[PDB]
Design a protein around this ligand. Structure first.
Ligand code: A1S
Ligand code: SAM
Length: 211
């Protein structure tokens, strides 16, 4: 059936159509719906300084329609946490490691909310990272994400004090990538694999080491 596709520098030539579609959906969702006005752009594409040659996109596709997704960025480069929100990680420190990737821009289009897709997206980050040998992901998120992580069996390590960010309670944390977490999620989604990787093989950890 429908799969989550891992899109990076090595295979984006197969997904240029899909990538553009997702930038516009990100604008509809994060700018128009969430009202994150600092991300508004006149081209109607929601693109920031962490959308570059090293970004990995995990996009839920139905045919060529993007129905959900999220992205990963190496913490060996300047990151959203290190550059924008370092005060949120003042207790433990901002991650900087080839084996830790920054996780952001999680979305499900309205048509697919409150269904099977969400848990598939939760499984997808675990599956991709385990395959790549990535040990942890880091995230800045609103505190309503905590019960969602816990419900999916995600092992969460807070990096600092929660704080108001543009009027919303926000925190920085890592998530442990675990075979055990993934195994349970595979059972729950009723699929042995949720991540499709077309085109040339990506060596994410090697790329992050170069950075
Ligand atoms: C890498 C990550 C960490 C970066 C995040 S990046 C920021 C998170 N992303 C977004 O807010 C994008 C806009 N939203 C979406 O794409 C979807 O609403 C998401 C968050 C993916 C959730 O989709 P689904 O789980 O399929 O279903 P849903 O009915 O939309 O939500 C399920 C439950 O989740 C909760 N929820 C969703 N959005 C919320 C919000 N803005 N504030 C407080 N609570 C919120 C809520 O409890 C809801 O159930 P309800 O109470 O019955 O409505
Ligand atoms: C929870 S935080 C940031 C992380 C967000 N959950 C994500 O994964 O994309 C949301 C707040 O950070 C801001 N923000 C998101 N990406 C940003 C960037 N690249 N630069 C500056 N601010 C950003 C948004 O305007 C919003 O007020």
């Amino acid at each position: 059936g429908a799969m989550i596709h891992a899109i990076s520098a090595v295979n984006r030539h197969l997904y240029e159509d899909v990538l553009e579609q997702h930038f516009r959906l990100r604008h509809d969702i994060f700018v128009e719906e969430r009202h994150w006005e600092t991300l508004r752009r006149p081209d109607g594409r929601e693109v920031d300084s962490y959308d570059d040659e090293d970004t990995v996109y995990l996009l839920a596709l139905e045919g060529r329609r993007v129905v959900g997704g999220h992205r990963l960025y190496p913490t060996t480069k300047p990151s959203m946490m290190s550059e924008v929100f370092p005060h949120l990680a003042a207790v433990r420190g901002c991650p900087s490691d080839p084996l830790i990737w920054e996780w952001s821009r999680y979305f499900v289009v309205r048509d697919r909310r409150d269904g099977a897709l969400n848990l598939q997206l939760m499984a997808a980050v675990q599956e991709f990272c385990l395959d790549q040998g990535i040990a942890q992901v880091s995230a800045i998120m609103e505190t309503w994400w905590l019960p969602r992580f816990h419900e999916a069996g995600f092992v969460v390590t807070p990096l600092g004090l929660p704080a108001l960010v543009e009027n919303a309670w926000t925190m920085a944390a890592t998530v442990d990538i675990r075979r055990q977490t993934l195994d349970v999620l595979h059972d729950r989604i009723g699929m042995p694999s949720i991540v499709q990787q077309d085109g040339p093989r990506l060596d994410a950890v090697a790329r992050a080491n170069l950075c």
